[PDB]
């Protein structure tokens, strides 16, 4: 599955992600900026993969992951984290996330996380 839902607080982080993943042959299905928009674009876009940032306004990433799996037990979520967010990454993996990339990431490091999950 080539179609990615990019969910991120920061515009600069959505753009890089758009640019790395579409370079690696993935289709950006769409984007979102908080946890509430994330779950809605997901029902809408039925993406194969989701990249989810933890720290976001209104609804944080782990709450987005939780709702997304109750909605779809088979989602494939990669969490985007900062250094020092290791505990939160764990709660993400606990809540369903299949893997994680960390900011600032190596473009190969983002591509293989994508590849490992499909």
Which positions touch Cu ion (CB under 5 A)? 8, 13, 15, 19, 53, 80
Nearer to Cu ion, 40 or 87 (CB): 40
Closest residue to Cu ion, based on beta-carbon distance = 80
Q: How many beta carbons lie within 10 A of that of residue 98, not counting itself?
A: 18
Nearer to Cu ion, 80 or 95 (CB): 80
Quote the crossing angle between the two packed helices 11-23 and 107-116, to the nearest 10°: 70
Nearer to Cu ion, 8 or 48 (CB): 8
Element (H, E) at 46: none
Nearer to Cu ion, 13 or 68 (CB): 13
Closest separation between CB of residue 12 and Cu ion, Å? 9
Instruction: Say how far apart CA 34 and CA 116 lie, in whole Å.
Output: 25
Closest separation between CB of residue 63 and Cu ion, Å? 16
Closest separation between CB of residue 73 and Cu ion, Å? 23
Instruction: Say how far apart CA 61 and CA 53 lie, in whole Å.
Output: 5
Q: Say whether 69 sits in a helix, a strand or coil.
A: helix
Closest separation between CB of residue 13 and Cu ion, Å? 4
Lookup: tokens for 36? 């509430």
């Amino acid at each position: 599955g080539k179609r990615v839902l990019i969910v991120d607080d920061a515009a600069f982080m959505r753009m890089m992600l758009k640019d790395i993943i579409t370079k690696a042959g993935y289709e950006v299905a769409g984007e979102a900026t908080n946890g509430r928009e994330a779950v809605y674009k997901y029902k809408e876009l039925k993406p194969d993969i989701v990249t989810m940032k933890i720290t976001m306004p209104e609804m944080n990433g782990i709450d987005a992951i939780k709702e997304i799996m109750k909605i779809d037990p088979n989602a494939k979520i990669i969490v985007c984290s900062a250094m020092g967010q290791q505990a939160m990454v764990i709660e993400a993996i606990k809540a369903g996330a299949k893997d994680f990339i960390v900011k600032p990431f190596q473009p190969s490091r983002v591509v293989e996380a994508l590849n490992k999950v499909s």
